[PDB]
Design a protein around this ligand. Sequence first.
Ligand code: NXL
Ligand code: CA
Length: 241
Amino acid sequence: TLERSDWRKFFSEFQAKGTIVVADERQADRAMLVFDPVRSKKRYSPASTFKIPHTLFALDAGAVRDEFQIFRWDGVNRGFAGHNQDQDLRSAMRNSTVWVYELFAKEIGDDKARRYLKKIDYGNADPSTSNGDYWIEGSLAISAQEQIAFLRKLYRNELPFRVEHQRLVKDLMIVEAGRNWILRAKTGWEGRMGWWVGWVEWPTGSVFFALNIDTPNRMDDLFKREAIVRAILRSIEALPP
Ligand SMILES: *C(=O)N1C[C@H](NOS(=O)(=O)O)CC[C@H]1C(N)=O
Ligand SMILES: [Ca+2]
């Protein structure tokens, strides 16, 4: 992995402290690019980025049939606007609707989660929790480098789930596309730090990214997750201007 310490200008452009790993598969044998290589190997809670593997778990276990199943909302104003309504997989992914995945969690075995996480070697694969949900308030942790490794498995259909379920999750991740490019990504926010992970597919190959930053300013820092990544991806012609 090649260290791009010059990428500090992008984090400073938005007054943030964080890391990013970028794996550029356009052409061949390009070095993996990293800002802050030590932090890039530090494990953090995946927070809402866990909805990527969590959806694979729920599909593989039968907690959700497909993209057309509607999950009826219990009528309790429990999050924000997009959470307080009936959900399908796409709305839950786009709005980061926590209560759908809480429902998936209880239906999935607590032992199944362990067997799942270990079968894919996701971070430390430890869903031990004391109170909250194990993917945000628990032992489960994964580094940026480990997110890249996981996303490439999903991209290559190499994960030990039905290829149909891998394809569905990759479709649910779509946040933007042009005629020549497709961006698939998911944000996460743990409270004190935050994520944006995913990749953008071009004709000549795909560019994977995993960024985490600290979020001392809480909500006012959330835009920085995408803003830093987009500036870096644009700098390497991985997103249009
Ligand atoms: C996921 O990290 N979360 C769910 C929700 N949306 O997060 S997102 O904007 O990063 O997709 C609120 C923040 C967070 C949580 N508190 O569970
Ligand atoms: Ca290539």
